């Protein structure tokens, strides 16, 4: 290529060692060439084989741990114990998704049973089940390097549901990638499979993913990131002659109740919720962003521990350049507001500062400008006149991951009003405890209402998250012989399916 | 301001003045909708069970009134609108029957571990909810099935969404009507007339507004291509882009193998039958047949253009639909490279059509492609099996896909049906694409332009999940639960645990 780039030393801002590729409309047109010429062999290979190759890939991915924790680690300043965490959890979301395939599952097979002798017309054999969009796209979160990213969720999922893959390196962690595609690429060598089933791009040019969400062989975009270059990509994906589904996880402030009862019966309420917004220096899509509270002494108590461990916080030293500077700029002019009070920790550029900010419901409702995600270990207190006002409040928030809420037996008769708008909202609710946790099995609902998500009704995280690369389609009166394997008579797949409407 | 639905026979106005509303009553049907969205949603299954099986009976004791307007407004056969009213009652209550078997929910749950290292495995629980509001747009072919009381409405009800409808101008009595049986039906069940409203007008601006809407939060369409993904366009660019199903139109493409033309000596006939149903005013009728150069297609050519020559004149749905008819199959008819086939007819009546092409030609004008709404079809000889194959790589999205063959083909249909699962929401085999049974494993959709969301279906059980959207709960006490959530399982639906089966 023309011209190369190279990855940002998280701790000191120089470049790192190794050159990566700046890849162009050019190499965008050969991958999604290559990939659809391999969609069709790809989703109908068998189950195990599907299943095989990810198990494969988990593997490939725990043998190259070393040389992941350590690149990642100076590309991310993310800590190698946290990293090393991340690589099992991508792993093991792997081999979730292996289980899942292997199962038979996300056929979701149905069938109709035909009634030759019915009148005034019979009624036919109808079959219907789930096959593969067609190549993907995939966009990496910056804060998940491993399991937001080249083989992450939305990699996983896809490869899973019969989807070869593309994925669009973030520019943030390109040696990290680079490793994870050749992970992969030695699972596909010895899985014996095209390695058009899986492409890696580099670049540092933004042409490069828009050339990728509109290429024509695309069919579906899985993303991570911010609102603004979320946003506009989904608007390109839907402007295509041929709208393709978007999955894009754009941002939350995730939203924590807390009632009087609650702080009373856990002294160290304060210390849990500043460890939550300050976890991966509070570098997490799930960071509890703000906390609606009542005007009582407790609360009084409350934010004055949370006050005095935010002075006391270690500097912090984020993502990127670009991360590290809307944070800092960011606090700072949102501090300068009036009816707002910050508490800064100590820390010189480039390591940032922790924030705590508190202010009155009041002028939380006359600051609209206040319920924008802030990225980096930073939070907001609300103080209520009331739990009306309380109530109110859950009534205008935005979409977002999550929702918490912090009660007890007593609190009860308003939580249970507070659910039904909270679920209008989040996707995750969580009762007495936080939100940063993700767990990944097969209730998990990670997204939202937008802009958690830009499509509600499906989840980037969990088992489910395979029906996103998935459409039906229905079989009428075919022979035995012709129909697949999943909806022959005899099941000799032996899957659960669901026969005019009972249970699978 | 107010306007007149049009006689379908005549051109003329019917009696009866309809209002034009405007942005105004979009914003009131709106708010109102919204705020019964939450207690709507919450209501026992049985309860929105028993509401839909009420709007089907309401809808049965006005038959007759439905079926003299629908036919007077749309020049649509009564025996049809008949069938059409038992399609749209029996369609109600199957949602009723999903709705009170609690399956929507797709209830799943986590067993939690308290003891795992090194971080406990929490209680996760999910279901699906309703998204909200939804606007619905009914398609002016299906006036009842397709519209007012029709598939979108009912799916949606039944998911537990509030529904608008904004009424066609090519049925506004036949609306009004469903949506005075809707209206009894609320009224019997005690619940709030804003679950249900119908909004009248001729001016674009209100269906613009009504889609642009904050409160609306997902659309159901059926119509043409150039409205419907205008309207796609307007629900995405908005700050909260919502979920826009619309079925916009499809040629649904059929091949037909030598052997097949050599067991049923009448497929010419029931090809004609088939496309010149309701005079051709299907959206999954054949507009195209490929099909192989040799003696039995000539034949079949042959048999189908003298049917053609017979037909009766047909009267369109309306004016509009009517001329655009005229104009492009007389347009179309214009090309070299293309024969075309007409019945005897005089405007306002308008003429079948059988247009006959080779392959070759074929991919010379990719806007043969185009959907022409109205009883006509064509026909695409193939140099070879090969030649066919090739085709069928480069078909755009379609409702449906069709073969004819016999077992000696067999080893070539087995290479075709992948290429079309790719294109097609439904294949259909040595059977005729346009009957939609209305069961639980159908799929009436498909890629663009078949609908602007191919993942989903506007008829059949499953339509009801385009309405829902999943909410997990992590460690909520049981009495805070949801009942289909509970530990002891109140409701006794089905439910997955830990990856098995429901
Ligand atoms: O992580 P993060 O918090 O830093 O979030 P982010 O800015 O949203 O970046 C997430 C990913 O999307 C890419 N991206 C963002 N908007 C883009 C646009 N409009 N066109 C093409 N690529 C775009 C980024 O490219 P870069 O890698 O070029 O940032 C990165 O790979
Ligand atoms: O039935 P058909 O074949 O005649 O199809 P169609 O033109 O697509 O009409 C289907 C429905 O969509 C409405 N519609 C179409 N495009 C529109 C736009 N861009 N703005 C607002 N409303 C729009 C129509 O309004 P009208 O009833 O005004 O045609 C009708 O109710």
């Known amino acids: ?3 190369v780039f190279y990855a940002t030393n998280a701790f000191t801002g120089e470049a790192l060692p190794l050159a990566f590729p700046v890849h162009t409309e050019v190499e965008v047109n050969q991958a999604a060439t290559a990939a659809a010429k391999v969609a069709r062999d790809f989703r109908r290979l068998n189950n195990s084989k599907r299943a095989s190759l990810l198990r494969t890939i988990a593997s490939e991915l725990e043998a190259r741990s070393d040389d992941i924790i350590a690149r990642a680690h100076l590309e991310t300043a993310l800590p190698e114990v946290r990293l090393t965490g991340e690589i099992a959890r991508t792993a093991n979301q792997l081999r979730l998704f292996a289980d899942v395939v292997n199962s038979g599952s996300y056929h979701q097979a149905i069938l109709d049973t035909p009634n030759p002798t019915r009148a005034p017309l019979p009624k036919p054999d109808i079959r219907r089940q789930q096959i593969a969009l067609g190549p993907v796209a995939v966009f990496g979160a910056s804060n998940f390097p491993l399991a937001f990213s080249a083989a992450g969720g939305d990699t996983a999922s896809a490869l899973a549901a019969g989807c070869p893959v593309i994925v669009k390196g973030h520019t943030a962690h390109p040696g990290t990638s680079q490793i994870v595609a050749e992970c992969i690429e030695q699972a596909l060598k010895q899985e014996q499979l095209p390695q058009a089933i899986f492409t890696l791009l580099q670049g540092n040019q933004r042409a490069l993913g828009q050339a990728l969400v509109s290429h024509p062989e695309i069919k579906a975009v899985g993303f991570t990131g911010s609102v603004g270059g979320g946003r506009a990509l989904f608007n390109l994906a839907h402007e295509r002659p041929e709208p393709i589904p978007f999955y894009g996880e754009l941002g939350a402030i995730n939203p924590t109740f807390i ?8 002294a160290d309420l304060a210390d849990q919720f500043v460890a939550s917004m300050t976890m991966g220096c509070g570098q997490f899509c799930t960071k509890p962003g703000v906390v609606f509270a009542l005007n009582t002494p407790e609360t009084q108590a409350f934010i004055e521990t949370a006050q005095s461990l935010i002075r006391q916080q270690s500097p912090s030293t984020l993502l990127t350049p670009g991360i590290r500077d809307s944070y800092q700029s960011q606090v700072v002019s949102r501090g300068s507001d009036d009816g707002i009070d910050v508490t800064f920790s100590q820390a010189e550029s480039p390591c940032v500062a922790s924030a705590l900010f508190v202010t009155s419901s009041e002028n939380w409702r006359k600051h609209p400008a206040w319920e924008e995600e802030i990225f980096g270990p930073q939070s907001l207190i609300v103080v209520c006149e009331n739990v009306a006002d309380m109530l109110s409040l859950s009534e205008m928030l935005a979409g977002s991951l999550t929702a918490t809420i912090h009660a007890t037996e007593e609190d009860y008769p308003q939580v249970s009003q507070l659910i039904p708008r909270l679920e209008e909202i989040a996707g995750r609710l969580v009762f007495n405890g936080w939100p940063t946790g993700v767990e990944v099995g097969y209730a998990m609902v990670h997204g939202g209402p937008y802009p958690a998500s ?11 998250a395979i029906h996103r690369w998935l459409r039906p389609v229905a079989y009428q009166a075919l022979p035995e012989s012709l129909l ?13 399916r669901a026969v005019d409407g009972k249970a699978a």
Not at 454 to 464: D, K
């Open 454 to 464: 830009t499509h509600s009704a499906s989840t980037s995280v969990g088992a489910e």
């Open 484 to 496: 697949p394997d999943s909806l022959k008579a005899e099941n000799p797949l032996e899957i659960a």
């Open 1 to 3: 290529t023309d011209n």
């Open 259 to 266: 009632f009087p009862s609650a702080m009373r019966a856990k």
